[model samples]
Target: HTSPLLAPVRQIHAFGDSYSDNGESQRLTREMLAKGIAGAQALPGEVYWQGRWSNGPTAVEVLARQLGAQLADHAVGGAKSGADNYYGWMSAYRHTGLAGQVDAYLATLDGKPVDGQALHFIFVSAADFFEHEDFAGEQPLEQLAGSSVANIRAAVQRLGEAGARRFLVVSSTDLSVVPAVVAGNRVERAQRYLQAVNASLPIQLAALRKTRGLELSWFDHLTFSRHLRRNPARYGLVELDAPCQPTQPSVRPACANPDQYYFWDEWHPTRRVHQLAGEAMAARYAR
Candidate 1:
């Protein structure tokens, strides 16, 4: 306990998308996204965990509770890695992108450095795949992947320069298997894009660690989701493929066995899965 390495984690600077968000708006809401809003529109308290896209508190929230840490939520649902969107049509919903979130955090510093002991958390990528599809690029699948990770890499670099010593970077799961992509018939595209991001992340992350002298921990949602799909019974997930909530927005009750299902909506997973993710993160990174 006397050593810095043995000291307790007391705060988290969360930065990402729906996967890391726990606020008063669902990811699927275009109106809320249009306003760059997160904490106002409410889901039924019983069904959506009082506005989280998941059925209960999300992974970061659960991690905060488990570690007894202060969490600053900078994640906004449906955000891409940067402020600019693909086409004019794509800009209908104003996203507070990952770059913007990092800027927001830096602004809060007011020329002061960040708490070196606090964990800087970042998790995103689903929107980069879904939002920038085609991006008017002849090869947007590859192009967007490169740019998104670059932007995220830039964010990490900025945070490191701004005094973030400890970083927890979470990867997005393979969205090719999710209901939204499956129904969109874009499984192949989703697979390609996620593979590219997953491939680039560790290389970039290691570069950051060496360049910045930071302690970095990676939480691999890619492998976790794959394992969950292959062995649902192992995780006590009976409904591995479907979601508990409907795709359309309306005040309604979710399926009776919310915990049995792995997904709560087309794109977001259930709280049970979030808990599992959080518990795994808490157990491993508390060191």
Candidate 2:
């Protein structure tokens, strides 16, 4: 069931926030290894923690491993689209946001080939839109949505110009289903924001693809997250509203069985959830 989009994808170039940042701290560790550090870190375990916000491998890592593709992840821990200077927010002070991640990818194409052998997976917007909307300041949902879409289109175009052929864009996760949303009494606003973004995203991407003649696949993570929240048992998940890690700052350790929980932290999913997400992604893209 492997689709043509994935059949020839021997390499993966991922760009996003914490959820997909497999290479978040990889570059630094590589430098350490090259410098003959006291104990040079190794793969499989070394790079596992750099960018991941979860208790274990993120869905991006799981998916790339499942596909048997070499992954070059460029996501940052708290990246956002509005973090760019042009946005007036200037949020990427200490974190490489969407714009920076795209720039990093472009920097690697000096003499590299992009013959559709690599698939670029991008998951963003939520970080950018949410940060600006909830904390930094408030803007119309439409404006936030449009700005996020524009950032994605710009990245896609930049990649296309650099000879990239295949792309996969993931929608923002449904924040309404997250426990923090309920805790903060933000469920209604979260739902509205997500709806606005989801409703307009396809239209925007369709226009981009038609104009650029791009090869793209849109993964509906929003819908998937909703389903996962409603029917955790179907996915062998028992707890959805609680995180395995203790919420109280006073707590010193994690819960005993994280696999039984859906969330690893207040916002991130657990490894079991990531595993199921990877499986679903493989099935979706399989020929």
Candidate 3:
């Protein structure tokens, strides 16, 4: 395994939540499949487009479509890094957590080693707090951060054992600024948790690389998100205060010009944000 990013990649295996999901984890998609609905085209609801939670394509799609790499996306919309989601016990849309996603990808291999020219991408987090107890603001941020990073590292180790040689690990993003979090009075606590994860994740990954004999690359989503917030104009975005799409009714209405808004819903960003992330990752990885 040489430099993970410096390769001629033909395939990419992606795992994460809504940010990286390309229409795999949505509840409606499953229902439609039960009745044999067509595909991404038919699954997209009024608020969602292309069966994705966002208005359009997610970050992984850019790498697949524009960059000409086949993608295997295993991300769910409401996924957590660890095995449990605080509210999964009752939800009809329980996302098999990140660990389960690893198992899912491995199953696809049918015991064969992963492609040597493939890259693995991870971009989960926020779900631990976003969907659970409104995050409560009572749990210790340190423990949460530790568990989250460890779960991700464990997934990486699992993939490495399955003969994966290269990985591109994207860190989590800010959740404190989300409209729901702020309006729910959890901004203070959310930022603290974000800070703890930011500080600990990279150090853990650095150690894992050496111990596991893995070639790794990193995209700092946390820092990049902050930059987008501070300099929205620099990115051709204007709306950042609220989500462009409503989350209530199934046939939810969306605001105009989705590309100009930062968020598409209460928890996810719009297409342009994903597009930017894709552009950044494509330029740096598999070059």
Candidate 4:
């Protein structure tokens, strides 16, 4: 029997939290996703957009360059660029329902078809954090996890049905490894919360692979953090918690060295890191 030969294909689509949104660097269409909801409880402690992500790029951007594919970013968070009160990214373009975005993307194909051999799609992260935690009495964490997996699955399925056979999904990295997360007090709760969300992703992804017959790859963020921590100063960063002078919320660390940190502002990554991540993905595609 011969293995299914897949020709290199590339197309990038992003979704998820502030870590995934790259609006500050570019004029993002849905900026409102970056700001907080009017009355919603904010994450503990004050946080500023630090512009700290390495490579000054989001995961989607990195993946796009790596794959040499056309990029279309749809990720939104609470602190996106061009965000306003009424019509925002998170509120309006929530990835939980990406069927609409898929329609828009499909329209952009301009009568060109995305066959498995030459077209690839990548979703960088999850958007479960935005939903109401307590969804009708189910464990808030459980509900959030369930909702995110379901939504992402739908999006991937749509893409598959639409002729995308090459897909890559970045798993939910350990948010606790982040400096902001570490500096906060809700480590236990937050870790558990994030774990629930992350746990369901791989299972769903595996199922998607089986059902769709596409290739999906994930980066190990938790392990990656360990490497980052050891080389912060070498990377031109003092610490992961620090942001730039203006964006720094406290005196502990500064965002002065973006190449050293994985986060830009409070959540995303710098262009340097994105480049490295892109290299990794691109290498896989080469094989």
TM-score of 4: 0.68
Put down candidate 4 lDDT per residue, 1-287, tens digits, no spaces: 63453445555565444455445322333232255434333221233333322335655666666667776565434421112211233344332234445655666788888656543433433333322221232546566566656666776787788887766665555655544455554356457756775677778878888987877765555555566567766656554654432243533554555565555544445565566556655555652
Error of 2 at 28 (Å): 6.5
Error of 3 at 113 (Å): 1.7
> For candidate 4, which ten residues in a row score worst on lDDT?
79-88
Candidate 2 lDDT at 40 equals 39
Report the Cα lDDT for candidate 3: 0.75
Quote the lDDT for 190 in model 4: 51
Off by over 4 Å in 2: 1-6, 23-51, 82-95, 133-136, 247-252
> Which model scores highest in TM-score?
3
The C-alpha TM-scores of every prediction are 0.84, 0.82, 0.86, 0.68
Cα deviation of 59, candidate 4, in Å:
3.2
* Ranking of all candidate structures by their lDDT, best first: 1, 3, 2, 4
User: Candidate 2 or 4, higher lDDT?
Assistant: 2
lDDT of candidate 1 over 29-148, digit per residue (tens): 445445665443433234556667677888998888888899987777666788632223334444367887787788878777689999998887777787655343465688878987
* CA RMSD, predictions in order: 4.7, 5.6, 4.5, 6.5
Global local distance difference test of model 4: 0.51
Selected candidate, larger lDDT, 1 vs 4: 1
